[PDB]
């Protein structure tokens, strides 16, 4: 298939939608690692493997300020925390488990919400 | 070498 919708339709509609995916992600039993900032100064690899590290510790603060109230806008930083953290974290030891679960659970919401449209 | 995710490098 080939369509790539990713249309949030209404901005406000996304505000509470991303708040929905996040609200369950913030209280997720595996989002603990995503609730903190990396080093951004002594963390080798970033600024190269982690284009947009991001993290609920600082990202969740935007949903309150409507800094990511759209399609890829919010999914970019969130999907980034999942795809960039896995770009280095073990393929399945301690970090992958969270990025795997969170990426799996929030999917049903962003997919039904109209974020992944896949 | 790749990401790090460790303690704070004390310089």
Swiss-Prot record, chain A:
Protein species of origin: Homo sapiens (Human)
Outcome after substituting residue 88 to A: Reduced acetyl-lysine binding
Swiss-Prot/TrEMBL domain comment: (Microbial infection) The bromodomain mediates binding to HIV-1 Tat.
The encoding gene: KAT2B
Residues in Bromo domain copies: 9-113
Compartments in which it is found: Nucleus; Cytoplasm, Cytoskeleton, Microtubule organizing center, Centrosome; Cytoplasm
Name of the protein in its database record: Histone acetyltransferase KAT2B
Entry similarity comment: Belongs to the acetyltransferase family. GCN5 subfamily.
Function summary: Functions as a histone acetyltransferase (HAT) to promote transcriptional activation. Has significant histone acetyltransferase activity with core histones (H3 and H4), and also with nucleosome core particles. Has a a strong preference for acetylation of H3 at 'Lys-9' (H3K9ac). Also acetylates non-histone proteins, such as ACLY, MAPRE1/EB1, PLK4, RRP9/U3-55K and TBX5. Inhibits cell-cycle progression and counteracts the mitogenic activity of the adenoviral oncoprotein E1A.
Known tissue expression: Ubiquitously expressed but most abundant in heart and skeletal muscle. Also expressed in the skin, in keratinocytes (at protein level).
Superkingdom classification of source: Eukaryota
Subunit structure: Interacts with SIRT1. Interacts (unsumoylated form) with NR2C1; the interaction promotes transactivation activity. Interacts with EP300, CREBBP and DDX17. Interacts with NCOA1 and NCOA3. Component of a large chromatin remodeling complex, at least composed of MYSM1, KAT2B/PCAF, RBM10 and KIF11/TRIP5. Interacts with NR2C2 (hypophosphorylated and unsumoylated form); the interaction promotes the transactivation activity of NR2C2. Interacts with KLF1; the interaction does not acetylate KLF1 and there is no enhancement of its transactivational activity. Interacts with NFE4. Interacts with MECOM. (Microbial infection) Interacts with and acetylates HIV-1 Tat.
Annotated disease: Defects in KAT2B has been found in a patient with isolated coloboma, a defect of the eye characterized by the absence of ocular structures due to abnormal morphogenesis of the optic cup and stalk, and the fusion of the fetal fissure (optic fissure). Isolated colobomas may be associated with an abnormally small eye (microphthalmia) or small cornea.
């Amino acid at each position: 298939g080939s369509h790539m919708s990713k249309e949030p339709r209404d901005p406000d509609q996304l505000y509470s939608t991303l708040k929905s995916i996040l609200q369950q992600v913030k209280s997720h039993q595996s989002a603990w690692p995503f609730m903190e900032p990396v080093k951004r100064t002594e963390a080798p690899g970033y600024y190269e493997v982690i284009r947009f590290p991001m993290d609920l510790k600082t990202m969740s603060e935007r949903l309150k300020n409507r800094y990511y109230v759209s399609k890829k806008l919010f999914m970019a930083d969130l999907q980034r925390v999942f795809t960039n953290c896995k770009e280095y974290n073990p393929p399945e030891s301690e970090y992958y488990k969270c990025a795997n679960i969170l990426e799996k659970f929030f999917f049903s919401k962003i997919k039904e919400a109209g974020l992944i449209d896949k | 070498s790749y990401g790090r995710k460790k303690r704070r490098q004390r310089c």
